[PDB]
Design a protein around this motif. Structure first.
Motif: not given
Length: 64
Positions: A24-48
């Motif tokens: 992540x830009x802030x030193x955290x983590x950004x997660x991308x998830x893919x399902x049925x050709x749908x995309x979404x992101x999550x933003x937090x301070x850990x992979x969890x």
């Protein structure tokens, strides 16, 4: 959130989601998830955190 998405996937008899993480830009983590050709992101301070946030977002897109 991840469990809810995986359970959803099971109930609807679809493929399981896949995840990928980047620094992540802030030193955290950004997660991308893919399902049925749908995309979404999550933003937090850990992979969890990011993983669940991503799972929640994509769940809503598909479920609702």
């Amino acid at each position: 959130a991840v469990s809810a998405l995986q359970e959803f996937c099971a109930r609807t008899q679809i493929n399981l989601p896949t995840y990928s993480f980047i620094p992540g830009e802030d030193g955290g983590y950004v997660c991308k998830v893919e399902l049925l050709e749908i995309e979404a992101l999550g933003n937090g301070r850990s992979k969890r955190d990011a993983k669940h946030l991503a799972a929640s977002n994509i769940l809503r897109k598909i479920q609702l």
